[PDB]
Amino acid sequence: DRPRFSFSIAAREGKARTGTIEMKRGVIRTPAFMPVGTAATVKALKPETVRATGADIILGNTYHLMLRPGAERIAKLGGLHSFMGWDRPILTDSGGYQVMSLSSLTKQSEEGVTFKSGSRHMLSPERSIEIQHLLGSDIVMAFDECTPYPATPSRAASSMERSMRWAKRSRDAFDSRKEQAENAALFGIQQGSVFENLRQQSADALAEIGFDGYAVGGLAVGEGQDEMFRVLDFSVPMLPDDKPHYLMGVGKPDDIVGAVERGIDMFDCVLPTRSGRNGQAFTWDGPINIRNARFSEDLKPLDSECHCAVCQKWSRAYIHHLIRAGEILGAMLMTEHNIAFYQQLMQKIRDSISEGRFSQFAQDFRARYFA
Amino acid sequence: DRPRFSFSIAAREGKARTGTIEMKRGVIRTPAFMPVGTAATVKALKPETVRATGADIILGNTYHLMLRPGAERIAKLGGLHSFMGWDRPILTDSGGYQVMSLSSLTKQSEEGVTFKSGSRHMLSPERSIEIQHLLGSDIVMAFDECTPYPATPSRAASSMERSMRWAKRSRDAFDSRKEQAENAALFGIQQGSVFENLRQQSADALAEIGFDGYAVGGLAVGEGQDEMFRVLDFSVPMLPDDKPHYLMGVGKPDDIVGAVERGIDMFDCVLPTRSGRNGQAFTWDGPINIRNARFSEDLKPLDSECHCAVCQKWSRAYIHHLIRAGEILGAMLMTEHNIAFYQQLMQKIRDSISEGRFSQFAQDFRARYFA
Ligand SMILES: CNc1nc2c(CC[C@H]3O[C@@H](OC)[C@H](O)[C@@H]3O)c3nc(N)[nH]c(=O)c3cc2[nH]1
Ligand SMILES: CNc1nc2c(CC[C@H]3O[C@@H](OC)[C@H](O)[C@@H]3O)c3nc(N)[nH]c(=O)c3cc2[nH]1
Ligand SMILES: [Cl-]
Ligand SMILES: [Cl-]
Ligand SMILES: [Zn+2]
Ligand SMILES: [Zn+2]
């Protein structure tokens, strides 16, 4: 049977790596893209359709499930996997992004954060880890604060220092629960805003505690690609080489390619699902907005090479009609195609690294996607 | 290869019949339930999922598709079957119900009806039949007026008489288009409100013209089950015995059972799809509203005997959560289950007639459904 957690690197090209994470509930091929399902559903898809696109793992969120349907309720019903019908690994975020994005609803202290709708709900390192246990998460995220962007060096340091104290509390809470420690994995989250010295201090603190994987937090918060890449250039090498590197919240296809070139192994983003429902379809020739009148009589599939079931069966003209009409099937088809596109991107990335031609793939990808 | 149209009755019990309609695009088992897809989609279902529930034919509508995406457009794109990805028979309504339901938007005359949004669109016997040709409909409905309910005898007679003149024009328009006459079928629609003498005059006029099937129009418009059944008691025997009998707009499960007991072979209704999206699930023990708090921790499937994929995989508690949260997957799962329930009802009806035990089935069905 599979181990609790084993990350193996099969091939490398520059800073890019490809390999596998073995866990009890399945194997995750890296670099990996995780579809997001905050409400215990990847919006508009059955789990079997998510799997048919090639996803090996999906993301849930402590914050959203605590509010609805409730963490204790999900545990009483048999856990998140059984509840939603996804039997493979699930990574759960800790709520640390909502500490920032929903801060106007909050009172924060060294002990944690209380959110006020008028109902109140508290998160802390201990309670976040407990919720993730009740959900039955396979990859548990430390409870952090996503520092707002921009941040002054002083405020970035204060925030990062609190997150590192919270990372140690997260580690100890996870380890004190035997069933969780034996069956799940725990990832730490690096903070430090855009400042190299703070990123180094954060990496050192996380490596001293020790985690199964390391996320780069605090990015994809408005800084733009040039700045994100500049921060990744120095930040990813600070993390332990032999553990997965997870860039939280990224991103557009070109963001993913450049992040892999900088040593990232895992990604999550709502872009393919949310923007799909809004009419944006990803193609090898760049995104299109299917609502545009130019598609009303276009009999081609969304993308001319895509192998997904949507592109095998339906035209741009039909999907244009569905989205314009507000039809649920439009959201279903756009979402399936976009998630399939993202997984095909990841597959091409993995194969090109394995074959030592990833730098050429990245150049070819960009030349065509931005033509 | 299959004929244009052949209806065969394999077994009978009282006024109830079971058999098949053979058409070029497939076989329809009767009594049949037709899921409704007015916008070129059965809402929230891929066609393959519609088929997996057991549906042999679906319903589209001249009126809705004329407005969006347009009849000529659908023809240019290869027809409705190719457009939406359903390759089996499609029955299209003629717009005659919208002549009544949307009458405040209309100007009516002996020549037809013009609808005003501010764009204007005209329907007539000739234009309705032409639109149904452009869509590539397999069963074409005559252009009628659905008489409002209640109606005075005078107004019911005037309306019915106009519909019969329009039925003859529909017949002649259909026959004058060789490709349509050779590959599709045409059904006439009986009117006459709740009045036996007018129903008889309408049946006689339709039989004199001659049609491939006969619909009972003008019911399921607020009259209630007792009155609907009273009208069916005398109306269905007036129609040719050897052709299908289609009750437009019916209905709830008990309405379907009683209508089959009165000689109806075909049904359409938005109830399973629309009420599914609103949280109503059909079960052998009667309908339930999945939004009710009593389902929040109920691990049973929607229905304890249902063979559908939803009942094999997900609990009431999960679907309750999805519907309460407004999640698209909730609409998808409720809809698939309800359409599957309707098809299982039709299968039990067909099997019980074939075995000469339909009267016992109807009694058992009602005892349990209304317990
Ligand atoms: C979009 N860019 C971005 N996302 C981010 C997320 C995930 C939000 C998670 O919250 C929900 O999205 C609002 C989804 O579940 C998502 O996975 C982050 N999570 C944590 N714990 N810490 C971060 O520093 C952080 C930074 C992010 N930047
Ligand atoms: C609900 N009860 C009911 N439906 C009916 C429909 C279908 C409406 C069609 O219009 C759309 O629903 C508003 C769907 O496509 C539906 O199939 C009818 N159609 C015609 N042509 N003539 C009738 O006398 C008639 C009576 C009905 N009674
Ligand atoms: Cl989303
Ligand atoms: Cl509907
Ligand atoms: Zn595709
Ligand atoms: Zn079911």
Q: Is the CB of B61 under 6 A from ligand 2?
A: yes
- Cα(A291) to ligand 3 centroid in Å equals 19
CB contact (8 A) between residue A40 and residue B321: yes
**What is the CB-side half-sphere exposure of residue A296 using CA atoms within 13 A?**
11
CB contact (8 A) between residue A85 and residue B313: yes
Q: Are B301 and B272 in contact (CB under 8 A)?
A: no
Q: Are B211 and B187 in contact (CB under 8 A)?
A: yes
Homologous superfamily, domain A1-371: Queuine tRNA-ribosyltransferase-like (3.20.20.105)
Cβ-based neighbour number of residue A368 at 10 Å = 12
Cα B213 to the center of its chain, rounded Å = 13
> Encoding tokens for residue B46?
């891929």
CB contact (8 A) between residue A328 and residue B327: no
Kind of pairing between the strands at B112-116 and B120-123? antiparallel
> Encoding tokens for residue A339?
């998630």
Closest CA to A329 of A75, A95, A133, A49: A49
Distance from CA of A173 to the nearest CA of B (A): 28
Distance from CA of B77 to the nearest CA of A (A): 7
> Encoding tokens for residue A337?
């195609």
Q: Are A293 and A301 in contact (CB under 8 A)?
A: no
Closest CA to A240 of A266, A261, A217, A210: A210
- End-to-end CA, chain A: 47
Q: Are A149 and A84 in contact (CB under 8 A)?
A: no
Q: Given 3-state DSSP classes, what are the helix, strand and coil percentages for chain B, each rounded to the nearest 5?
A: 45, 20, 35
Buried b (16+ CB within 10 A) or exposed e, B149-184: bebeeeebbebbbbbbebbbbbbebbeeeeebeebb
Q: Which one of A38, A318, A337 makes the best mutation probe of the B interface by having the most chain B beta carbons within 10 Å?
A: A318
Residue A279 φ/ψ, nearest 5 degrees: 100, 0
A345 Cβ contact partners less than 8 Å away, ≥ 6 residues apart = A33, A253, A256, A257
Q: Which one of B49, B318, B334 makes the best mutation probe of the A interface by having the most chain A beta carbons within 10 Å?
A: B318
CB contact (8 A) between residue B315 and residue A41: no
> Encoding tokens for residue A35?
């579809």
Buried b (16+ CB within 10 A) or exposed e, B270-302: ebbbebbbebbbbbbeebbebbeeebbebeebb
**What is the CB-side half-sphere exposure of residue A333 using CA atoms within 13 A?**
33
CA angle A57, A62, A67 (to 5 degrees): 130
Which residue is listed with tokens 């000529």? B72
Residue B109 φ/ψ, nearest 5 degrees: -150, 175
In chain B, residues with a C-beta closer than 8 Å to the C-beta of A40 are 318, 321
Q: Which one of A46, A84, A290, A327 makes the best mutation probe of the B interface by having the most chain B beta carbons within 10 Å?
A: A46
- The answer to whether B217 is a known ligand-binding residue is no
Q: Is A43 on the interface with B (CB under 8 A)?
A: yes
Number of H helices, E strands in chain B: 16, 16
Return the residue whose CA atom lies nearest to atom 5 of ligand 1. Answer: A249
Q: Is B332 on the interface with A (CB under 8 A)?
A: yes
Name the residues around ion ligand 6, CB cutoff 5 A.
B 306, 308, 310-311, 337
In chain A, residues with a C-beta closer than 8 Å to the C-beta of B318 are 40, 77, 83-85
Burial label for A207, CB within 10 Å (0-12, 13-18, 19+), is: middle
Q: Which amino acid is at A8?
A: S
Cα A284 to the center of its chain, rounded Å = 22
Task: Find the discontinuities in chain A where C to next N exceeds 2.5 angstroms and give the residue preceding each.
Answer: 117
- Cα(B36) to ligand 2 centroid in Å equals 10
* Three-state SS sequence of A62-110: HHHHHHCCCHHHHHHCCCHHHHHCCCCCEEEECCHHHHHHCHHHEEEEC
Return the residue whose CA atom lies nearest to atom 18 of ligand 1. Answer: A97
Q: Is B73 on the interface with A (CB under 8 A)?
A: yes
Q: Is the CB of B84 under 6 A from ligand 2?
A: no
- The answer to whether B93 is a known ligand-binding residue is yes
Sign of torsion over alpha carbons B236, B239, B243, B246: negative
CB contact (8 A) between residue B68 and residue A321: yes
A226 Cβ contact partners less than 8 Å away, ≥ 6 residues apart = none
Active-site amino acid positions of A: 93, 268
Q: Is B38 on the interface with A (CB under 8 A)?
A: no
- Cα(B2) to ligand 4 centroid in Å equals 31
Query: Resolution in angstroms for this experimental structure?
Result: 1.2
Q: Is B58 on the interface with A (CB under 8 A)?
A: no
Q: Which DSSP letter does residue B142 get?
A: P
CB contact (8 A) between residue A69 and residue B43: no
Residue B283 φ/ψ, nearest 5 degrees: -135, 165
Q: Which DSSP letter does residue B25 get?
A: T
CA angle A183, A185, A191 (to 5 degrees): 160
Q: Are A322 and B46 in contact (CB under 8 A)?
A: no
Cβ-based neighbour number of residue B326 at 10 Å = 9
Q: Is the CB of B189 under 6 A from ligand 2?
A: yes
Q: Are A366 and A254 in contact (CB under 8 A)?
A: yes
Q: Are A264 and A29 in contact (CB under 8 A)?
A: no
> Cis omega (within 30 of 0) on the bond before A31?
yes
This structure was determined by X-ray
- Cα(B21) to ligand 5 centroid in Å equals 36
Closest CA to A180 of A302, A75, A305: A75
Which residue among A44, A69, A78 sits closest to B321, beta carbon to beta carbon?
A69
Kind of pairing between the strands at A106-109 and A185-190? unpaired
Q: Which residue of B has its CA nearest to A310?
A: B46
Ligand 1 probe mutation, A146, A194, A270, most atoms within 8 A of CB: A146
Q: Which residue of B has its CA nearest to A65?
A: B321
B59 Cβ contact partners less than 8 Å away, ≥ 6 residues apart = B34, B35, B36, B37, B90, B91, B92, B93, B268
Number of H helices, E strands in chain A: 16, 16
Q: How far apart are CA A215 and CA A212, in angstroms?
A: 10
Distance from CA of B297 to the nearest CA of A (A): 7
Return the residue whose CA atom lies nearest to atom 21 of ligand 2. Answer: B96
Q: How far apart are CA A370 and CA A290, in angstroms?
A: 18
- Cα(B334) to ligand 4 centroid in Å equals 12
Chain A with chain B: Cβ pairs closer than 8 A: 86
Q: How far apart are CA A142 and CA A160, in angstroms?
A: 13
Q: Looking at ligand 1, which atom is closest to the CA of residue A61?
A: 15
In chain A, residues with a C-beta closer than 8 Å to the C-beta of B40 are 318, 321
Element (H, E) at A247: strand A245-247
Sign of torsion over alpha carbons B252, B255, B261, B267: negative
Catalytic residue among B56, B93, B212, B265: B93
β-pair partners for A90: A58
Which residue is listed with tokens 């009126």? B63
- The answer to whether B79 is a known ligand-binding residue is no
Return the residue whose CA atom lies nearest to atom 8 of ligand 2. Answer: B97
